[model samples]
Target chain A: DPSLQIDIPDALSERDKVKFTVHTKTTLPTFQSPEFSVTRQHEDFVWLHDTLIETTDYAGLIIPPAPTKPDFDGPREKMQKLGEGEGSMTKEEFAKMKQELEAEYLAVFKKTVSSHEVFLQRLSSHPVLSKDRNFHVFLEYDQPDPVGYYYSDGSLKIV
Target chain B: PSLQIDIPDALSERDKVKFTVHTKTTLPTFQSPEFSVTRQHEDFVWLHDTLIETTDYAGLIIPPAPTKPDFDGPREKMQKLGEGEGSMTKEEFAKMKQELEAEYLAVFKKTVSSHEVFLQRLSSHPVLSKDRNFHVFLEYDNWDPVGYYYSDGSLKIVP
Candidate 1:
């Protein structure tokens, strides 16, 4: 039985951050819904990873590492520089250079999404972690900072 | 566009993968209309390096070397999962086993395709296709890179 499937099918790069749209489909009754999606920032993912690592209950289990921060600033800056010097080269040359930079940017974006998806899939596949209240909240909640609110009981915990 | 090539099969050994590179070409330069040769990752790197060192083709862009295959992460995950199986439900254990196996095979397949693409790029090039080294790569069995360097140093093809 394919019990759970998690994927980040779409993401957008903002000024200095990337917003990943995590989509999930599960047949497990523990979840509030059979299918759902959430918008998440990189920091939110880091927080989840940190929370799992700090939990004494899972000390015996292997925690999948948090994905590294998505850094598109380098690629963004290169594209910016290329745009600034657009008139210095032939149309063909500029197009070629832009195409190359676009591919580089797309590659980075694909890897960023892949790492985040892997982190979630690992949790979902684990016996103890799959049943974790925090993991369920992360998948089922539709609001912002779902884990933070759930962890605080009645309020948000900034940690 | 007289050449077409692909890797139709690959077998993974403990430390390396053996790829059967199959080629079909309409070019008369090849001794046969179709042939296949076995190669490893190191051999692909050698071919890429040889192409780079041949200064005669400096004006042409050489395909980049395929990144090294990585199986450590998936292997570690499977090992831990096996250890923790007693704690998981039967369905959960089976699901994880399937997912991990799929992940491993995807990574393996990607590596094979990268090596195949490197050869295809070389074989499709009009100038590179006729080169003696590329010919030997597709037809010869277990040829030594070092021997080729010494034997053909003075007979290098001039593009």
Candidate 2:
């Protein structure tokens, strides 16, 4: 019930093709195609603010740096917190144990990535997911022209 | 009715006396790379909670996405037989959506407030109903990964 609402006017699908440019501090090779987009989480926030609409000079706005000051909604947590060893359980063993804990913690975090992939895989096999996801698929227009772009800090920021 | 397709050149004309036209269509490509990494750097994550029972999410949906169409939103199914019902009233659906939200936090220790997540009430993706797995992306403090999610989770302290 608390989710952000985003109603992208159908016009985005029919507009004169808005393209994007990724202005990173540095460029890395092999990672071709410097495209940008408003992902689901980020899309909603900008949509609520009317950033990607027909009324706004959408193309002109995107070409320049329309740095939007968005808010951070999610929390910061490592989740798997390892303890500082048992009280006086021996120094050498504690370091070894700590190292082991870190490895496992990292592994679990890796599991997090694989896990998301698994969910996405399921969605691929799911009809509703495919259909629902397809909405954005059309919204994903080619970057025919770029006046500016959305900058996300990993969460889809239309800055 | 004159119609010609596939194999080109089927018209009766001095059209270059049967010309072979050459054209290329270009899909826009991003001049940027590492889109996902940017978001990952900015990602926030809350780990799994193994304490809760999966049954708490019994009526809730996992992998909420592509906002289910009203026709299959399934609230109508919630109506009991012989109860003189068609589907839940607006109030009932709101109540149901939140119930699923709370249970989502209880088990996943995360909020589904972002439109990315929702109170999906489907009988599919049994793992979404499970507590151990999660939907996640690579985010080691501030990296980017915006596309899809795993049925579980991920946070690669990437390379």
Candidate 3:
């Protein structure tokens, strides 16, 4: 249960945790966990995993959130026979329309990729982890295609 | 007549150089419960009137390398910077402190002009090496660059 929700993990394995990757969606940071288990620690240290132990029922939601569907909702296949059946449009006309749609998809795909690169960069470059510490909270978004969570990996440090 | 007896002492300089390594990573030993200590009535008090390093204390001095005590060294991980105060028995704490001291001297030879190791020996003095029931507090911090010692690992607030 806690494994699904990594941010503020209550699992013992998460303690002394440095970096973690998990399944999530496009909408919210992993704090988006639908339900939460919380406990309070008397002292406070952000890097310490247990100043306050917490669990989010991310199982409630498989991933962060799908990148909002691209705004356009037109067709997406190449014309099977330019002059037949569904391919009534002239080749020049179809070419123009298809090219426009392709450009639109590329723009959004690239934007999402940029967001992804930024997040990964921040992740690997974010903390100074060591044996003495390993806990962390991360919000994951932009479920790539196919409606499930995917993972990319990385690490950084302070010696 | 002055007797030339060696009593371990502090360096007069505050370790401003910063102990650094090419790379270090926190081992994933996992973590225990996270919590805080009950607040004390006093916000806090310095054992010394002002921030002081080994060099600041007249009695504190670097132990001679040959005189160094030999021990297996800490098998467990390091405590978070400034995180350990009374986690171990007073005796056990001293042994590790000695080992750490040896490391400080051995690794940081460049700035004997860079009296940083001397300064850190005072900082990490592990036990802060003491036989007294009282404790000293030097919360982790970085300056010259002005950032957190334990926090910020090295955004150093510069970047």
Q: Tens-digit lDDT track for model 3 on B1-159?
A: 010111111121223222221111132221111111111112111333232333445465433221122112221223331246367676576566556544444423332222223323433454433312112121111223221111111111110
> Could you give me the TM-score of model 2 versus the true structure?
0.20
In terms of docking quality, how is candidate 3 classified?
Answer: incorrect
The residue-by-residue lDDT of candidate 1 on B74-154, one tens digit each, is 778877988888898977986897787667677776777778788888877878877788877886643311110001001
The per-residue C-alpha lDDT of model 3 at residue B130 equals 36
lDDT per residue, candidate 3, A90-134, as tens digits? 655664554445444344334433333333233333223211122
Candidate 2, B75-128: lDDT as tens digits: 233232214323658556646645533332232211212212321221124444
lDDT of 2 by residue, A27-142 (tens): 22322323323322333324422433333433343221222322211111221232333565665455455444534543543443333223323333333332332333333433
- Given the true complex, what DockQ would model 2 score? 0.01
lDDT, candidate 3, at A78: 32
Q: Alpha-carbon error at B46 in model 1, in Å?
A: 52
Instruction: Give the residue spans of candidate 1 off by over 4 A.
Output: A144-159, B1-159
Model 3 per-residue lDDT at B63: 31
TM-score against truth, every candidate = 0.46, 0.20, 0.19
Q: DockQ numbers for every candidate?
A: 0.01, 0.01, 0.01
lDDT of 1: 0.69
Error of 1 at B118 (Å): 35
